[PDB]
Design a protein around this ligand. Structure first.
Ligand SMILES: CC(=O)N[C@H](CCc1ccccc1)C(=O)O
Length: 330
């Protein structure tokens, strides 16, 4: 089997992407944030505290003839950005782009933090990291991809995120028309539960490529590119007037600047992020200071190849016994 679904930016900045997901019988379609940095499929629901729902579409398990309470199971998650959610668990039928999994754990939110409430466009998350990170207790649950893997034509999914445009998530096949040149497969460590890999270096604009091992995660659920402070300083030094601000909380540059590209290495291959992808526009409405798309990871503990990086590539996630990541230009 295979599946194919369009993923759409939630706003004009590509802050996140939503993909429609069918849950239950009859189907209830919710727009979920596919997140290769986490491993829970959780949704706003009829159980979510009413004051914490503000425009999201909710899953109502009592209206699904295939829903079953997973007795005793609870979940609770905290994300790298400080947001969080928690609740109980049902199993139900879940379909993405024509690919159906029966018995998928659907984590129903009883509580969500304010950042989720305040974002009316995201109805929940669909985690695509390794199932060892799933938070369901006392019996950890499998991700949608892990449940589908055995049925797929090939045990892979691909992320093809658009710049200011829709893109595609495919399951079970590699669309050879969706990229240019060849795909580069790099080794993955699953020791932390992430799609963790090692980049062979970087360049700023037309500058020389610096060969250096940069170990990070491929994370579709993170907006920006977070890299070591040395790398980030080298990038922003090429933008007149750019500075790191303590009050704002990262690098900012004049909104009148033209940004240089940023290249990252995947083996001997190179992925080029155009300068425009690094512009996250005014810090506040009407401001002439713009917020940068490449930021320091120094306070995170891990480097993160988020959407800024991934949208410049066609990315293959391989869930076979030897995992690997693939990157192609497009
Ligand atoms: C970029 C690079 O060095 N790739 C190699 C092979 C990556 C690989 C591993 C297994 C099967 C196919 C491909 C590596 O990371 O070890």
């Amino acid at each position: 089997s295979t599946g194919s679904a369009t993923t759409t930016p939630i706003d004009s900045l590509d802050d996140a992407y939503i993909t429609p997901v069918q849950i239950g019988t009859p189907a209830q379609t919710l727009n979920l944030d596919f997140d290769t940095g986490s491993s829970d499929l959780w949704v706003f629901s009829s159980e979510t505290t009413a004051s914490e729902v503000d425009g999201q579409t909710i899953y109502t398990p009592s209206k699904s003839t295939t829903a079953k309470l997973l007795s005793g199971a609870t979940w609770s998650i905290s994300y790298g950005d400080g947001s969080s959610s928690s609740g109980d668990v049902y199993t139900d039928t879940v379909s993405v782009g024509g690919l159906t999994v029966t018995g998928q754990a659907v984590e129903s939110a009883k509580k969500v933090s304010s950042s989720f409430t305040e974002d009316s466009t995201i109805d929940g998350l669909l985690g695509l990291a390794f199932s060892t990170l799933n938070t369901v207790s006392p019996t950890q649950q499998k991700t949608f991809f892990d449940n589908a893997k055995a049925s797929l034509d090939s045990p892979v999914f691909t992320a093809d995120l658009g710049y200011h445009a829709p893109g595609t998530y495919n399951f079970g096949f590699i669309d050879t028309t969706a990229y240019t040149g060849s795909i580069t497969y790099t080794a993955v460590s699953t020791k932390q539960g992430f799609w963790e890999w090692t980049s062979t270096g970087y360049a700023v604009g037309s500058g020389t490529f610096k060969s250096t091992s940069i170990d990070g995660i491929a994370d579709t659920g993170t907006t920006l590119l977070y890299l070591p402070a040395t790398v980030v300083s080298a990038y922003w030094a090429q933008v007149s007037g750019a500075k790191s601000s303590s009050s704002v909380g990262g690098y900012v540059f004049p909104c009148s600047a033209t940004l240089p590209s940023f290249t990252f290495g995947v083996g001997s291959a190179r992925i080029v992020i155009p300068g425009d992808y690094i512009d996250f526009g005014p810090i506040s409405t009407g401001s002439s200071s713009c917020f940068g798309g490449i930021q320091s990871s120094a306070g995170i503990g891990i480097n993160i190849f988020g959407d800024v990086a991934l949208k410049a590539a066609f990315v293959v996630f391989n869930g076979a016994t030897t995992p690997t990541l693939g990157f192609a230009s497009k």
